[PDB]
């Protein structure tokens, strides 16, 4: 039971659009809570820009109604950002880069009560040993969620999400054959990923209180 030709076409489309980076020059800037926050918001803005570009290329996305396209993008932005962060946390980066990124996020006005779950979730993801295909598919599945608020046509979204889940199930069998619970483990992490919507909203209101200002794109997608 390998991938069918239409599944191979679907997977390649997802892969090509996913591999089109958030980290420019983190290093060129000084370390202090103010600069760490600005770097953080600059990387989150870059991530939203690449998310919109990936989303508009998902097969069938352009066929959906304009309002449902916006509901899917706003509803997924925070989860997709935590998933991408978990991918980067587990990415083999040069000697120091991960440590600088990690140190910047710990000194950016975020309470350690959010940092603890965040990094626990990130460590939990790395133990799964996901391939670039698993991260690309999981992102597409997160974006094409039929249970987001303000979707007028939910069956249309489910029709797009369904083939992606079928592909992910098959990849788990191919790439993780000794762990038959791997697919169920990935969907368990999606459930854990949804808890960050609440945590993010809390971090946002703490930043607002300390008069932090966000970039125009983050203001629109996060409703700040």
């Amino acid at each position: 039971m390998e991938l069918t030709p239409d599944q191979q076409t679907l997977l390649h489309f997802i892969m090509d659009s996913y591999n089109k980076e958030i980290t420019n020059k983190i290093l060129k800037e000084a370390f202090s809570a103010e600069e760490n926050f600005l770097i953080l918001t600059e990387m989150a803005t870059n991530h939203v820009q690449v998310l919109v570009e990936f989303t508009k290329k998902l097969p069938g996305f352009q066929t959906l109604d304009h309002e449902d396209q916006i509901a899917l993008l706003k509803g997924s932005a925070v989860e997709a950002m935590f998933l991408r962060s978990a991918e980067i946390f587990n990415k083999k980066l040069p000697s120091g880069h991960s440590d600088l990124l990690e140190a910047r996020i710990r000194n950016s006005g975020i309470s350690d009560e959010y940092i603890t779950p965040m990094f626990s979730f990130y460590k939990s993801i790395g133990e799964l040993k996901m391939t670039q295909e698993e991260y690309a598919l999981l992102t597409a599945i997160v974006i094409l969620s039929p249970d987001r608020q303000y979707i007028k046509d939910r069956e249309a979204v489910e029709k797009l999400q369904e083939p992606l889940l079928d592909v992910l199930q098959k990849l788990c069998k191919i790439h993780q054959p000794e762990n038959p619970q791997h697919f169920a483990c990935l969907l368990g992490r999606l459930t854990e990923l949804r808890t960050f919507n609440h945590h993010h909203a809390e971090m946002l209101m703490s930043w607002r209180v300390n008069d932090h200002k966000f970039t125009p794109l983050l203001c629109e997608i996060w409703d700040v």
């Binding site: 820009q49 919109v52 508009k56 304009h66 396209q69 916006i70 993008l73 706003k74 125009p216 794109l217 629109e220 997608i221």
Partner: peptide, 9 residues
């Protein structure tokens, strides 16, 4: 809103 619609189109 407008910025998201601009980026989507």
């Amino acid at each position: 809103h407008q910025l998201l619609r601009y980026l989507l189109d």
